[PDB]
Amino acid sequence: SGFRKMAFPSGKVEGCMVQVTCGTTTLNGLWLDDVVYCPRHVICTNPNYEDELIRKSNHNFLVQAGNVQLRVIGHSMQNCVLKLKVDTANPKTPKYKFVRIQPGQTFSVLACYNGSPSGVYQCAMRPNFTIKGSFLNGSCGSVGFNIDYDCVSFCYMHHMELPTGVHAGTDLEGNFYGPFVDRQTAQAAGTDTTITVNVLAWLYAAVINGDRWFLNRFTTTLNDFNLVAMKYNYEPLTQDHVDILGPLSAQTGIAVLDMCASLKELLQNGMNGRTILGSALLEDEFTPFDVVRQCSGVTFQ
Amino acid sequence: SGFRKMAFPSGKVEGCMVQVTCGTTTLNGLWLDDVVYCPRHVICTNPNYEDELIRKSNHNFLVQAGNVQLRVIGHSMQNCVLKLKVDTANPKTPKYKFVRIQPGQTFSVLACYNGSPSGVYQCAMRPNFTIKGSFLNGSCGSVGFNIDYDCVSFCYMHHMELPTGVHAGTDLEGNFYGPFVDRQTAQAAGTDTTITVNVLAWLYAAVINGDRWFLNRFTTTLNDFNLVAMKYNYEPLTQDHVDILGPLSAQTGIAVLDMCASLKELLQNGMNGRTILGSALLEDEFTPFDVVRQCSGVTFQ
Ligand SMILES: *[C@H](O)[C@H](C[C@@H]1CCNC1=O)NC(=O)[C@H](CC1CCCCC1)NC(=O)[C@@H](NC(=O)OCc1ccccc1)[C@@H](C)OC(C)(C)C
Ligand SMILES: *[C@H](O)[C@H](C[C@@H]1CCNC1=O)NC(=O)[C@H](CC1CCCCC1)NC(=O)[C@@H](NC(=O)OCc1ccccc1)[C@@H](C)OC(C)(C)C
Numbered sequence: 001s002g003f004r005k006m007a008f009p010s011g012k013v014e015g016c017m018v019q020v021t022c023g024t025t026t027l028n029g030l031w032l033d034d035v036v037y038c039p040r041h042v043i044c045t046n047p048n049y050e051d052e053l054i055r056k057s058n059h060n061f062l063v064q065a066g067n068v069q070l071r072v073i074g075h076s077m078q079n080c081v082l083k084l085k086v087d088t089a090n091p092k093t094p095k096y097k098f099v100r101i102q103p104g105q106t107f108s109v110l111a112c113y114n115g116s117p118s119g120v121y122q123c124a125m126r127p128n129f130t131i132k133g134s135f136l137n138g139s140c141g142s143v144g145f146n147i148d149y150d151c152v153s154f155c156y157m158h159h160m161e162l163p164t165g166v167h168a169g170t171d172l173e174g175n176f177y178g179p180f181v182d183r184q185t186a187q188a189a190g191t192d193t194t195i196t197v198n199v200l201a202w203l204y205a206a207v208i209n210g211d212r213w214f215l216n217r218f219t220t221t222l223n224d225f226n227l228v229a230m231k232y233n234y235e236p237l238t239q240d241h242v243d244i245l246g247p248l249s250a251q252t253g254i255a256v257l258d259m260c261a262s263l264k265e266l267l268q269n270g271m272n273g274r275t276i277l278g279s280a281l282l283e284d285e286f287t288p289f290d291v292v293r294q295c296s297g298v299t300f301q
Numbered sequence: 302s303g304f305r306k307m308a309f310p311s312g313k314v315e316g317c318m319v320q321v322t323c324g325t326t327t328l329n330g331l332w333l334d335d336v337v338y339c340p341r342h343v344i345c346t347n348p349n350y351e352d353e354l355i356r357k358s359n360h361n362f363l364v365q366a367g368n369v370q371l372r373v374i375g376h377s378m379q380n381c382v383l384k385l386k387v388d389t390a391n392p393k394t395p396k397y398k399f400v401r402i403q404p405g406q407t408f409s410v411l412a413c414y415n416g417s418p419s420g421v422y423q424c425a426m427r428p429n430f431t432i433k434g435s436f437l438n439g440s441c442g443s444v445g446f447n448i449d450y451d452c453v454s455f456c457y458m459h460h461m462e463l464p465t466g467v468h469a470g471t472d473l474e475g476n477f478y479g480p481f482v483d484r485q486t487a488q489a490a491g492t493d494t495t496i497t498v499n500v501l502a503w504l505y506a507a508v509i510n511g512d513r514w515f516l517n518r519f520t521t522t523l524n525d526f527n528l529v530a531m532k533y534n535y536e537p538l539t540q541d542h543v544d545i546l547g548p549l550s551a552q553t554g555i556a557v558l559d560m561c562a563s564l565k566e567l568l569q570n571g572m573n574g575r576t577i578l579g580s581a582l583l584e585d586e587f588t589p590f591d592v593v594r595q596c597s598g599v600t601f602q
Contacts, residue, residue: 001466004435006420009411011312066602110310116600119307120421132579134305136598165302165511210466278433280581297437299417301367 003205003277005285006294007108008147010120015092018070019115020084020141021062028112028141029063029084030157030172032093036063036070036084037172038141039159040077041182049182053077058084064115065090079174080182081157096152098172103127104195104235106287107144107155114138123156124198124285126166127235128190129178133158133167143172147300162189195284196234197241200259202283204248205291206276213274215254218261225260232267244288304506304578306586307595308409309448311421316393319371320416321385321442322363329413329442330364330385331458331473333394337364337371337385338473339442340460341378342483350483354378359385365416366391380475381483382458397453399473404428405496405536407588408445408456415439424457425499425586427467428536429491430479434459434468444473448601463490496585497535498542501560503584505549506592507577514575516555519562526561533568545589 020029020038029038043052044060056075061084063070074085101107103125111118111134123131123144135142135158144156159169159182166189168180180187203214220228226236237260245256266282277283292298321330321339330339344353345361357376362385364371375386402408404426412419412435424432424445436443436459445457460470460483467490469481481488504515521529527537538561546557567583578584593599 001437001462002433002435002468004420004422004424004433005306006412006422006435007308009311009315009418009421011310011315011418014310014312111307113598113600116602117310117312118598118600119305119595120310121305121307123305132303132305134303134307134595136302136596138598161302167303275582278582281576281579294420294435295437297414297419297439299414299419301417 001209003209003294005122007120007122008145009300010108010110010117012094012147012152013110013143013145014117015094016090017110017112017115017117019064021064022056022060026114026138028115028139030141030143030154031065031070031086031090032096034086034089036086037081037157038084039157039170039182040080040082040174041140041159042082046183046185049077080159080170080176081172081174094152095150096154099153099155100171100173100175101125101155103129104198104287105155106285106290107146109133109144109156110142111135111139112142122285124195125177126192127195128192129180130162130166130168130189130192131156135161135167150301162187164189194232194234194282196229196237197244197288198284198286199234199263199282200237200245200256201248201288201291202277202286203259203262204245204252204254205286205295207252207254208291208295209277211276214262214266214271214276216262216265218265219255219258220261220264222257222260225257225264228264228267234267247292248288302510304510304595306423308421308423309446310601311409311411311418313395313448313453314411314444314446315418316395317391318411318413318416318418320365322365323357323361327415327439329416329440331442331444331455332366332371332387332391333397335387335390337387338382338458339385340458340471340483341381341383341475342441342460343383347484347486350378354383381460381471381477382473382475395453396451397455400454400456401472401474401476402426402456404430405499405588406456407586407591408447410434410445410457411443412436412440413443423586425496426478427493428496429493430481431463431467431469431490431493432457436462436468451602463488465490495533495535495583497530497538498545498589499585499587500535500564500583501538501546501557502549502589502592503578503587504560504563505546505553505555506587506596508553508555509592509596510578512577515563515567515572515577517563517566519566520556520559521562521565523558523561526558526565529565529568535568548593549589
């Protein structure tokens with residue numbers, strides 16, 4: 001038992017991180033087979049990136065993989081990611097996919113500087129398409145990812161920080177999450193909401209782990225629940241969310257809508273000096289899958 | 302910016318995990334050079350382990366490293382760890398040390414089942430020598446560790462769960478942290494305390510990240526602070542702790558004892574509907590080193 005904010009093992013991704021240097025800019029790149037993916041704002045001189053990139057030569061891109069300098073033999077831009085063709089395929093290339101995740105989905109971030117991993121932590125895509133990361137200068141190109149059995153599904157690459165201290169980036173095909181653009185003009189996150197289905201998942205994690213104090217006898221209708229959710233800036237719970245919460249409901253014997261009744265009282269009364277799973281806040285960065293994964297011990301080969 | 306519960310990159314450790322099977326027991330082992338370390342309670346039949354181990358043959362130990370079965374050519378017991386001599390040195394053996402950490406120190410846990418990594422998370426050694434882990438059956442032998450530049454310092458190997466849902470284990474030389482013994486007789490954690498110096502470190506993390514609302518004009522004496530700390534079940538702050546908090550004090554311009562004044566008011570008034578670094582509780586599982594590492598971007602080769 002116990003319940004932790006758990007990241008995926010990072011080794012498969014560590015084996016792909018490289019340093020990409022162009023001009024006075026150093027950031028991280030992702031080396032899969034013979035391509036290095038990195039944010040396009042690595043390039044030189046309201047930017048027009050097509051113009052900027054046409055002015056570049058391959059030898060402008062210094063790619064360091066450990067103590068090995070990688071030779072760029074071509075380059076292309078796909079949306080906001082640059083793809084550097086290199087003459088060597090990464091022998092550590094895992095089995096991988098590129099996936100564009102939905103808000104509310106979680107992932108592990110391997111924070112990197114100069115191609116070297118610094119730390120790993122779990123993140124959710126917020127409803128406003130930011131992530132509350134931990135990122136300093138030089139962390140651009142760090143990726144977020146999930147693992148399924150043996151496949152690394154990359155879903156995030158870091159581009160920029162917004163004035164509230166949250167972070168914005170793209171999928172690995174270079175499409176920003178949210179309305180953000182890779183130019184240093186004024187942009188702001190947008191008002192966020194709490195990921196309701198994930199809070200319910202974490203309440204089920206709590207029950208699985210022996211916390212039951214927040215339960216009640218009541219029930220609620222989905223309609224009636226969503227009316228309370230909106231008042232507290234929670235995402236509407238859909239029937240799909242209810243269905244996704246099925247396995248957790250079945251394992252605990254607590255109907256989804258009964259858990260919704262508990263959450264409603266938690267929203268209306270607070271927790272009154274008590275904690276759930278070591279938290280004094282309602283936690284929303286565990287998906288139903290995360291809960292089931294951690295509470296049943298799924299591993300990855 | 303941003304501040305996350307960040308674990309070390311786990312890949313160097315993932316490359317060492319193996320499955321150890323003996324009788325009807327399967328758990329994890331740590332393969333470094335030609336030795337596999339695992340909890341001694343893996344062996345068969347108030348146990349007397351010397352008697353139990355003398356009755357064993359090498360071929361009773363099934364060691365799986367991926368799809369490769371490792372041959373045990375010898376075995377010995379050191380405290381509560383078993384060491385299985387195998388005929389193959391792990392080629393992925395990182396540079397490593399074994400270290401016995403002090404309560405309050407943090408580490409990353411690579412949770413494993415059947416030799417396969419499941420997840421990574423950050424943990425502290427509690428003052429009562431438990432850890433609040435996330436561990437199911439089969440996770441024994443998962444290790445906790447820190448990384449310094451390129452060296453993996455192993456400090457924890459998982460043995461058992463206690464009735465409160467917390468966890469007890471040993472250093473990699475098999476010495477339990479705390480008074481615990483590896484027998485299924487009644488044992489209990491002991492009353493825990495909050496790791497004061499770490500709370501102060503995390504308040505400095507908060508300031509570094511733009512949270513200043515909890516600061517005040519006041520100061521306090523170490524004596525006067527510790528008198529309030531004890532009332533709230535906090536560890537005494539020592540002058541060594543104050544000195545360790547020097548770099549963070551110097552970077553933020555907030556004298557340690559001034560931060561102690563802030564913590565005292567936080568203890569006395571609560572936070573009153575406000576959060577610090579996304580938490581509604583005073584967080585104590587970041588060491589001063591953790592804060593400086595994350596807020597300045599130290600990486601690991
Ligand atoms: C790449 O390593 C860094 C990572 C940043 C650095 C600090 N934390 C991070 O996550 N990325 C940047 O430094 C990028 C670089 C530009 C990205 C767009 C194309 C040109 C290069 N810049 C930012 O992340 C800045 N954010 C920003 O400009 O946002 C739009 C904006 C502009 C003006 C007002 C409001 C919003 C950051 C560094 O600037 C602030 C932290 C001041 C917001
Ligand atoms: C190894 O993979 C598991 C990991 C456990 C399983 C659940 N969570 C974990 O972290 N370890 C065990 O299952 C060990 C095995 C014994 C360890 C001592 C030597 C003999 C094998 N057992 C426990 O971890 C149990 N704890 C325990 O017995 O503690 C002492 C005790 C005994 C009686 C009353 C109170 C305390 C766990 C599995 O039992 C409880 C969860 C019921 C405490």
